[PDB]
Design a binder for this molecule. Structure first.
Ligand SMILES: CCN1CCC[C@H]1CNC(=O)c1cc(S(N)(=O)=O)ccc1OC
Ligand SMILES: [Zn+2]
Length: 257
């Protein structure tokens, strides 16, 4: 089965998932000098107010926090999105070290981790149908510096012991994801894919410029998680990121100067 090691890693993914060498794969490197301001972009609308988180899960790849997406209560509009995308889950990618962990790079620079808040276009009814469409999903990417602690992440960090190994899941109601947001909503956007299998090319990417600082103690607990299942050889969940991909025939736009 696919993973992040030497024998099942990203370089082995094209065999079971030929789209890996597709035309719009993610992540990519965002060259800040060639990225172009897009006057045509409508202001981004993040409305995670009546967001209802339910549980967190270790899927032997990351840890995800799930949301009731049975109403338009947490939504992402505006910017490149011509529609309304509903929040369903969010998850992280981090490294074994602070100088790596992010999936997207900025001028080749690699962050300690990267946050993916995931949304699906409501005109397609469910997520299963959404994922089969070029404009199916929109994912909000936020970078993570190691520095000062992020309070709105700690409630997450503290429940990570109860979901150490693949298959485990704990209750995670009443978490507000707005705490994970940075100050500015300035972003690069491009047409991309999922960054793990099945690597479907169904995603509009909105990667924010301004990262969040999390403490060294915080990201350290992400690293204490296991890839393996209970009572198996202990693989540490670290470096769960796919390297940047050929941009090919794509422009990374920007929402500023
Ligand atoms: C827990 C909810 N699951 C079941 C239903 C929705 C799904 C959530 N997963 C994803 O949307 C997803 C996102 C990425 S990404 N944005 O590139 O980081 C990569 C692979 C993914 O799934 C295979
Ligand atoms: Zn991701």
């Amino acid at each position: 089965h696919w993973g992040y090691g030497k024998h099942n890693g990203p370089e082995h993914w094209h065999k079971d998932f030929p789209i890996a060498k597709g035309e719009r794969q993610s992540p990519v490197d965002i060259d800040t000098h060639t990225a172009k301001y897009d006057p045509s972009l409508k202001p981004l609308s993040v409305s995670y107010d009546q967001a209802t988180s339910l549980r967190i899960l270790n899927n032997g790849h990351a840890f995800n926090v799930e949301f009731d997406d049975s109403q338009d209560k947490a939504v992402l509009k505006g910017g490149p999105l011509d529609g309304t995308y509903r929040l369903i889950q969010f998850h992280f990618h981090w490294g074994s070290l602070d100088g790596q962990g992010s999936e997207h790079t900025v001028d080749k620079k690699k962050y300690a981790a990267e946050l993916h808040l995931v949304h699906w276009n409501t005109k397609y009814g469910d997520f299963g149908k959404a994922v089969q469409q070029p404009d199916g999903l929109a994912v909000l990417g936020i970078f993570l510096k190691v520095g000062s602690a992020k309070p709105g992440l700690q409630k997450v960090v503290d429940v990570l012991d109860s979901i150490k190994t693949k298959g485990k899941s704990a209750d995670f109601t009443n978490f507000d994801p707005r705490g994970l947001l940075p100050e500015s909503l300035d972003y690069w956007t491009y047409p991309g894919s999922l960054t793990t299998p099945p690597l479907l090319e169904c995603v509009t990417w909105i990667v924010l410029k301004e990262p969040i600082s999390v403490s060294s103690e915080q990201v350290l607990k992400f690293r204490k998680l296991n890839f393996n299942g209970e009572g198996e050889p202990e693989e540490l969940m670290v470096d769960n990121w796919r390297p940047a991909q050929p941009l090919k025939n794509r422009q990374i736009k920007a929402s500023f100067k």
